Design a protein around this ligand. Structure first.
Ligand SMILES: O=P(O)(O)COC[C@H]1O[C@@H](n2ncc3c(NC4CCCC4)nc(Cl)nc32)[C@H](O)[C@@H]1O
Ligand SMILES: O=P(O)(O)COC[C@H]1O[C@@H](n2ncc3c(NC4CCCC4)nc(Cl)nc32)[C@H](O)[C@@H]1O
Ligand SMILES: [Ca+2]
Ligand SMILES: [Ca+2]
Ligand SMILES: [Zn+2]
Ligand SMILES: [Zn+2]
Ligand SMILES: [Zn+2]
Ligand SMILES: [Zn+2]
Lengths: 520, 516
């Protein structure tokens, strides 16, 4: 028997400092969780106790808070080096600043292998990015060797900016030849570390022969064995066991998101590299684990530059602004209503030209905002909600295109995918019992060609003026029908600026869940 | 036979100048209607053509626009004298400024009889007011005499400020002895002119023996025979014929409101004062009738005082603010939503709920004037000078208030509620007191406000006008069952504050009120 402890993080999303338990800015420090200084403490405590330890990242360190807006990846390279990560798989967000935004801040500065077997570079980019990322890495672990094969979501070109000189091959197709190569190199212990979501992770475990453990991200999947330590409801047991097609039991792990937890799985391997047993659970990074003084002091040095921002309050909230994914990707969430009202207000202020409707991919809502901080909302709080630097664009759509967009919003409902829409000037009702593509049972919209605006059934053959983020207007999130069927598209103001000017105009905000979205 | 032409107006409500067709401020003068200068022109044309003419007012000349806010009734006395009205019945709004606000500006200055048979004065007020108003007046009309008996709503002490020295008797009870007295005085032709609403008007016609014609107001009832000239949908034929208990056919007339129409009914009487036939229709006072130059010039002299109010724009509206009664007393109206949002905003800057008697919404606001909203526009919407008060109520009291809101739905009564932070659904097929089928309210004891079914045993913080908080509009359950009542800011100031903060407004009818 040979034992390995896999320590793992995924979807940290610029949460370098300890956060509130919902991962919003830390205010009451005694109840704060996560951060890199606290993570360093737990890792050290496990490394001290266990002989064979790997610390892995399943991607999406990039994009999330003012840490990234300012350091653009340099903070990721620096503090992951400080923590001595053994390997990292590339996430879709690592491409948000293009290949140059990945190469210079992270690929050239990381002292640990960065992996992806399903990303192939072509032509001009190929010679530049040579060995800057790898398909796998064979890591010495004590008297053994462990192979770690990387993978990144197929939909990265539709979620990010990877550019035209990167070919995103199907995960399973690209993984099997890499795993088979490692077997010929007599690497009997194989970890698939990647960023495609829990459903693809279970598929890789099932189909890719020779993979022993799948470590994933992207779906922000919380898995737990027994009674959970916080507010996250588990999606299944930890580890999640997949019975593979070749007749093996393959554990699948994920550690939620935002560095709130440290994934922890102890594996017993046999002489031949097969998993005999696996047990563990994600470790809640709460107050009972102290922040490392050395890392903390270094975080405070790097914080001086973020503090240069105005601590000026854009306004106050008397209600909790629910910007969490388990709300905004599943049902009507008051943060979505606020952003849609900000969108409509911005466009109706300077204007046919009359815009009453708003759509907004819930997945584009990246953080909640707490109201107990005397209700204060600053640019830093807002930048965690809207970090992508997009614009709120004006589009002209047929009712049939909008009916299609709303069918797409729920086409794969239940997987925590980002396409679920938050709305303004629309009253939609879904019936999830119905087959995908026929789930919209009611779709009323606010009339424009009326002196008194009211909700009327959406007409297939009619034309509507919709305010939506540029991401959607450009057919992002699988909304092909918008880019292909739109009749007019006009660029709008910057997303964060639209919301901050609205908050400033309102002074005190109180958005509610009021029935814009219903389920029968 | 002897023919009489009854010309009549009711519920003019300070509409001294010509207005828009919805009775809001006149902007595009070429499409404007009503006003006293135009009314004077039609009256004059009828008077030259017909030998026997009476011009009557069925009350509610008072309260409505900045004309009243400034002139406090003096403008009513002056321009009704100019038009040479033959008689006027007292409306509930004639008491809005108390008895002193009725005595000095109007009663002492009117050159025509002011009537009410069901209002009895007691003690100190009695000796002051003697003969300033009368129960009836016998008017010479050619070689004949016509008796006009007046009446005022029983509900005046609960709608206005008449004071404690005025006893408002039931209309029918007070009318019959007065009509009977006139019969002994050999007055064979009797008109009941009053202000209690169409339903009481039909009742008076039916029960008060000897009344030949009922001229009314208060319900803003539009009656028409044939195809109507404007946007008002008739409530019945003109005149409305009631078969009285003594067997006779009694015509009932009303001329909508705001001086948009002039009521016009020709009556053929027999030598014994019995109506043989009656025919007519309200005359639309549109652009095809010129404003009288003399009255118009005099309106312009009286307008210099109002003009002193700075036309500073509080904000802009990109939508029509529907503040009409046929909307706000029947269903969810975007003006009600705006005022309720202004109410909630004022108090939240935790109170999530708002109720607002639709009858307290007195005018719409047009958006085609480049969207401009001034204090003058707002003063026509909120003319009563009330406050938006904080109240603490049990869910059962609120369920009662919502049952009262629709208890007599269909009569254009003011109690129908406009709401904020409430989602109500009614089923009018159901018996009164059991019409509320859904009542969800915005939670307070929650971090994220959502709509939850109203709990009978729970306590709620509601923002409502002082009028309602003090059990007005028949909302006895509020004054009697409330747990806490706190005075709020002045109604017009709350809304103007809000409009100024929002700059551009766009309220919508969004489903706060539904009908099953
Ligand atoms: O965040 P993970 O990859 O861990 C999982 O969630 C993914 C979801 O987030 C949403 N999303 N993704 C990217 C993206 C975006 N695009 C700019 C331009 C290129 C990158 C940023 N802008 C907006 Cl408005 N929302 C975005 C979207 O709803 C997606 O399904
Ligand atoms: O106007 P008319 O008499 O022709 C017919 O409509 C009557 C309706 O109007 C409403 N109403 N009446 C009076 C009144 C008010 N009271 C102040 C104190 C004393 C006078 C003004 N304040 C408010 Cl918020 N609304 C009021 C109420 O909804 C009533 O049913
Ligand atoms: Ca193996
Ligand atoms: Ca008679
Ligand atoms: Zn992520
Ligand atoms: Zn991702
Ligand atoms: Zn009236
Ligand atoms: Zn009245």
């Amino acid at each position: 028997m040979w034992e390995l402890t896999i320590l793992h993080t995924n979807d940290v999303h610029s949460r370098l400092e300890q956060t509130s338990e919902d991962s919003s800015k830390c205010v009451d420090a005694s109840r704060c969780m996560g951060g890199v200084a606290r993570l360093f403490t737990k890792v050290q405590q496990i490394r001290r106790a266990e002989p064979n330890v790997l610390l892995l990242d399943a991607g999406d360190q990039y994009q999330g808070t003012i840490w990234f807006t300012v350091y653009k990846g340099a903070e990721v390279a620096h503090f992951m080096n400080a923590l001595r990560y053994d390997a990292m798989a590339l996430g879709n967000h690592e491409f948000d600043n293009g290949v140059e935004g990945l190469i210079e801040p992270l690929l050239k500065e990381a002292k640990f292998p960065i992996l992806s077997a399903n990303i192939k570079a072509k032509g001009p980019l190929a010679s530049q990015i040579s060995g800057l990322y790898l398909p796998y890495k064979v890591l010495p672990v004590g008297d053994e060797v462990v192979g770690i094969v990387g993978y990144t979501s197929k939909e990265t070109p539709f979620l990010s900016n990877p550019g035209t000189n990167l070919v995103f091959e199907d995960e399973i197709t690209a993984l099997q030849p890499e795993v088979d190569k490692l077997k010929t190199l007599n690497v009997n212990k194989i970890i698939a570390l990647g960023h495609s979501g829990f459903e693809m992770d279970k598929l890789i475990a099932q189909k890719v022969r020779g993979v022993d453990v799948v470590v994933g991200g992207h779906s922000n999947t919380f898995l737990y064995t027994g009674n959970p330590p916080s507010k996250e409801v588990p999606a299944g047991k930890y580890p999640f066991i997949v019975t593979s097609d070749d007749g093996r039991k393959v554990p699948v792990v994920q550690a939620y998101a935002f560095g709130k937890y440290l994934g922890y799985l102890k594996i017993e391997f046999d002489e031949r590299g097969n998993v005999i047993s696996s047990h563990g659970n994600p470790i809640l990074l709460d107050s009972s684990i102290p922040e490392d003084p050395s890392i903390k002091a270094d975080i405070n040095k790097w914080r001086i530059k973020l503090d240069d921002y105005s601590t000026q309050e854009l306004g106050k909230t008397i209600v909790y602004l629910d910007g969490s994914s388990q709300s905004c990707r599943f049902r009507e969430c008051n943060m979505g209503n606020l952003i849609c009202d900000a969108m409509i207000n911005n466009n109706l202020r300077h204007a046919w030209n009359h815009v009453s409707m708003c759509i907004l991919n819930g997945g584009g809502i990246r953080s909640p905002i707490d109201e107990r901080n005397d209700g204060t909302i600053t640019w830093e709080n807002l930048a965690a909600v809207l970090p992508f630097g997009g614009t709120f664009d004006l589009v002209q759509l047929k009712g049939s295109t909008l009916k299609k967009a709303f069918e797409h919003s729920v086409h794969r409902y239940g997987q925590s995918t980002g396409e679920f829409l938050q709305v303004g000037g629309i009253h939609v009702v879904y019936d999830l019992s119905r087959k995908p593509g026929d789930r919209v049972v009611k779709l009323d919209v606010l009339c424009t060609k009326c002196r008194v605006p009211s909700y009327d059934p959406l007409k297939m053959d009619e034309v509507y003026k919709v305010i939506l983020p540029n991401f959607l207007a450009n057919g992002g999130d699988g909304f092909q029908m918008i880019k292909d069927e739109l009749l007019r598209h006009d660029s709008g103001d910057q997303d964060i600026n639209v919301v901050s000017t609205y908050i400033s105009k309102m002074k005190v905000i109180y958005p509610a869940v009021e029935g814009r979205i219903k389920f029968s």
